[PDB]
UniProtKB/Swiss-Prot annotation, chains A, B:
Pathway this chain belongs to: Amino-acid degradation; L-phenylalanine degradation; acetoacetate and fumarate from L-phenylalanine: step 5/6
Keywords noted in UniProt: Acetylation, Cytoplasm, Disease variant, Isomerase, Multifunctional enzyme, Phenylalanine catabolism, Phosphoprotein, Transferase, Tyrosine catabolism
Cofactor binding annotation: Glutathione is required for the MAAI activity.
Residues in GST C-terminal domain copies: 88-208
Subunit structure: Homodimer.
Compartment list: Cytoplasm
Alphabetized Gene3D superfamilies for the sequence: 1.20.1050.10, Glutaredoxin
Full protein name: Maleylacetoacetate isomerase
Pfam family, one: GST_N_2
EC number(s) stated in the UniProt entry for this protein: 5.2.1.2, 2.5.1.18
N6-succinyllysine: modified positions: K53, K173
Cofactor(s) this protein cannot do without: glutathione
Residues modified to N6-acetyllysine: K28
């Protein structure tokens, strides 16, 4: 049974939960509380599992994999159907570019451990600017790549990164009015079963 | 002729230059000076090319692609040989995980625009801690995945990310003694032609 180390409120974990649900893969969750006392991401045990001290980490087929996108691509290659990546290389480049923009160009800057180093007074502003600067660019890219979803008319890895990042944007009270395409796609994705069963509000570690 | 927008001293651009050289793809460089007066990454023109205002961006086969790894995977899928990714999915997950750790978990935190927001007095320390915390974890992963190179005995995308990040580590005067495996692999990679012809010191925008 695959084991996913996750935190119900982490955008990075939600990306993998969506992929596991779309792929119909049953998995066990081992929650890692990122906020209580330095959180468990620093306990001696989790650190030995993932030295970067972050979630998600996935145990599957007898191996341990860190990095949400590396995990999602592993799942795409090992359980092909239903596909999370298109067939055409140019459309695959749009999916990867959008995925990397969010996961490597926006989220890292508003990651908890970076916000802790920034100082309470500047946190909200720091997170907001990382997100508005990233969405300013993403919304422009989407004008070109988007159909029903981020790239064309099928759900892809880029969409698994857009939904969690938008929830983050809502948490930091970012005004999404400047981004109608992101918002439109976000709404369409949220009604899908894979984005509901994997939601932060329905995890085993979600507070009662 | 493919066009690469690059800055000779940017680690992200160096990753793509290495891939273009390994693939034997001839390309034109259009330098974007990241430091002179806010640098050209903010000029009205570059911003219209890449709204994230970062290099590299690659024009090839009639399309424009941003995000160094999305570009490298596009090149791997369109010019298969010589390969930058192994065949076995579990080894491909090690390559992607190491690549994402560096490109999404270390570099973003020491990126110029983040360092500008941090303040001169804290910059060196901020960049150093992003790198030592990332290398502390990478060196542990390598104990498991490394052969001659990051993953096994062939050069892969993870290696194209390790070399530039190590140069960054040298620039910020990070002590690499705690990481013998990273250092060992770095030395072995640097003697390879693809990592020399693509070096920061041999670009059209390198100062005379
Ligand atoms: N690039 C990594 C980032 C993972 C990471 O940043 N995880 C966050 C949750 S979104 C967390 O565990 N951070 C712990 C904290 O900052 O201490 C991925 O895509 O897996
Ligand atoms: N995740 C992007 C990051 C690219 C980016 O951060 N580029 C840096 C050079 S390493 C730069 O253009 N930064 C401009 C500055 O910070 O203003 C990639 O992998 O392409």
């Amino acid at each position: 049974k695959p084991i996913l180390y996750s935190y119900f409120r982490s955008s990075c974990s939600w990306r993998v939960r969506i992929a596991l649900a779309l792929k119909g893969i049953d998995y066990k969750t081992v929650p890692i509380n990122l906020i209580k006392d330095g959180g468990q991401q620093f306990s001696k045990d989790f650190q030995a599992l993932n030295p970067m001290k972050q979630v998600p980490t996935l145990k599957i087929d007898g191996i341990t994999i860190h990095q949400s996108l590396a995990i999602i691509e592993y799942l795409e290659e090992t359980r092909p159907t239903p596909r999370l990546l298109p067939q055409d290389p140019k459309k695959r480049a749009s999916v990867r570019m959008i995925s990397d923009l969010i996961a490597g160009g926006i989220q890292p800057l508003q990651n908890l451990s970076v916000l802790k180093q920034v100082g309470e007074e500047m946190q909200l502003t720091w997170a907001q600017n990382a997100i508005t600067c990233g969405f300013n660019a993403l919304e422009q890219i989407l004008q070109s790549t988007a159909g029903i979803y981020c790239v064309g008319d099928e759900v892809t890895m880029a969409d698994l990164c857009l939904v969690p990042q938008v929830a983050n944007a809502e948490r930091f009270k970012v005004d999404l009015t400047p981004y109608p395409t992101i918002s439109s796609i976000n709404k369409r994705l949220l009604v899908l079963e894979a984005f509901q069963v994997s939601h932060p509000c329905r995890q085993p570690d979600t507070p009662t």
